[PDB]
Amino acid sequence: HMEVTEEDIAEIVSRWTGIPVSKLLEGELRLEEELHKRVVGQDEAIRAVADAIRRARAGLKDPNRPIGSFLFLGPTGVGKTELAKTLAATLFDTEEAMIQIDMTEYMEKHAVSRLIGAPPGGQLTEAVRRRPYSVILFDEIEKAHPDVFNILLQILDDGRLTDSHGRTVDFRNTVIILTSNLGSPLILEGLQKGWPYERIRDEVFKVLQQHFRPEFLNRLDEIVVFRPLTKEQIRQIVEIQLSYLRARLAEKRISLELTEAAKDFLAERGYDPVFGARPLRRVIQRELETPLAQKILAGEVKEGDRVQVDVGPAGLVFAVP
């Protein structure tokens, strides 16, 4: 039977139950390759997440806990959020299924009420109430007030939270992702001041031991250390970040052919150890989109054209065969 599809039936069941389509169609796995469509490198992170999901779906884990819980260590701008968003879209149909909580906004004692509700629901509890199938991302976890930190421990331990009214909110269908870049600025400080490797490594271990206790770490499925990106990995990210632009140009049958020097130009400006690849978006906007816009408006780049992008003296240069 060809007319009614698997997706048709899943859609009806999803609307009737609240269970996401991808969740119902999970069986019809190759989750790593799917996540890799959007996340370049961080192979260890990807396998950690997929392995935990496999253990849960196979019935090997405690049913009264989240699907998975992770701490993502390592530097900023190298894929922690891209993985969380991709995971949400892949497991739960959409990126809207990622809930982000910035712990720098939860540093003071009374922030607990922002999470679970004021004393006689709050941000987190109400969010998870309407979307039980969610990836919850807590950024800079070490900055949370102890009272806030304790509420996370309840989620990990019990797979649920009681809000400030007395109602239990279910977290058994969530994935928990905690992030911290602790250690990364310290390394940069030591490399700039010229400490021997030995002192840098000792100091990193010290700050980790100060903020993260074994009793906390033991609760997690995995601790993953994200790595700085290689030059080739940054080049692959350049290509991904150009997809939308390429799609827009394709409507006018315009194509963009970047030389290797041009791709390296964007890669070199769009990434550093301090911000990771966070700068790359506005580098592409300023170095490529803007002068390309001028050419299109000037009639120099026409519908149908293949445009070669190279490195000139003043930045990128555009030529039309």
Residue 200 CA from chain centroid, whole number: 28
**Of residues 169 and 242, the one with the C-beta less far from ligand ACP:** 242
**Of 78-86, 109-117, 161-169, 199-207, which segment contacts Mg ion by CB under 5 A?**
78-86
Asked if residue 86 binds Mg ion (CB under 5 A), the reply is no
**Of residues 81 and 90, the one with the C-beta less far from Mg ion:** 81
Q: Quick one: which of 55, 107, 45 has its CA closest to 79?
A: 45
Asked if residue 125 binds Mg ion (CB under 5 A), the reply is no
The option from ligand ACP, Mg ion, none interacting with 277 (CB < 5 to 8 A, set by class) reads ligand ACP
Min CB(96)–ligand ACP separation in Å: 17
Min CB(80)–ligand ACP separation in Å: 4
Tell me if 224 is assigned to a ligand binding site. Answer: no
Tell me if 79 is assigned to a ligand binding site. Answer: yes
**Of residues 79 and 121, the one with the C-beta less far from Mg ion:** 79
Min CB(293)–ligand ACP separation in Å: 22
Q: Which residues bind ligand ACP (CB under 6 A)?
A: 39-42, 76-82, 139, 237, 276-278, 280
Min CB(275)–ligand ACP separation in Å: 8
Min CB(179)–Mg ion separation in Å: 7
Min CB(10)–ligand ACP separation in Å: 29
Kind of pairing between the strands at 175-179 and 135-139 = parallel
Tell me if 125 is assigned to a ligand binding site. Answer: no
**Of residues 174 and 180, the one with the C-beta less far from ligand ACP:** 180
Name residue, tokens 């004692």: 109
Asked if residue 81 binds Mg ion (CB under 5 A), the reply is yes
**Of residues 56 and 177, the one with the C-beta less far from ligand ACP:** 177
Numbered residues of the known binding site: 74-81
Which residues of this protein are in contact with Mg ion, per CB under 5 A? 81
Numbered residues of the known binding site for ATP: 74-81
